Write a structure and sequence with these properties.
Belongs to the sorting nexin family. This is Sorting nexin 25. Residues 5-119 form the RGS domain. It is classed as signaling protein. This protein has helices at 6-11, 13-25, 29-42, 49-60, 69-72, 74-79, 84-110. It has 123 residues and is mainly α. The chain has two domains: 1-26 and 105-123, no CATH class; 27-104, no CATH class.
Length: 123
Amino acid sequence: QKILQFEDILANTFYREHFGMYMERMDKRALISFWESVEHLKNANKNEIPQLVGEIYQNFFVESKEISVEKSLYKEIQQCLVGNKGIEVFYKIQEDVYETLKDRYYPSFIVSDLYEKLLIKEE
């Protein structure tokens, strides 16, 4: 009956892993992995926060482009991502990635063969 809400899809490890498998089919699993990394940051102890923020950059923002802003301005990027500013930036990107996952990818996941596995067959 009632459609699972995308908020609950990402809150439940069993649901979210199935949605991640669907994103892998689209070769866009880095979108949900980045969302999961920022969310893990929101619920992490502060002794791990700066190293996690650094691993987020090293896992999702180090794609080497031909016009290499990442290499030419490495120090300059890190300094404008230093403290609460960097955490606030990663939060805003997570918010934008969330809307893209919700509006562009979640509707086709509901009609995929994976949404069935999230439904309880009543006995």
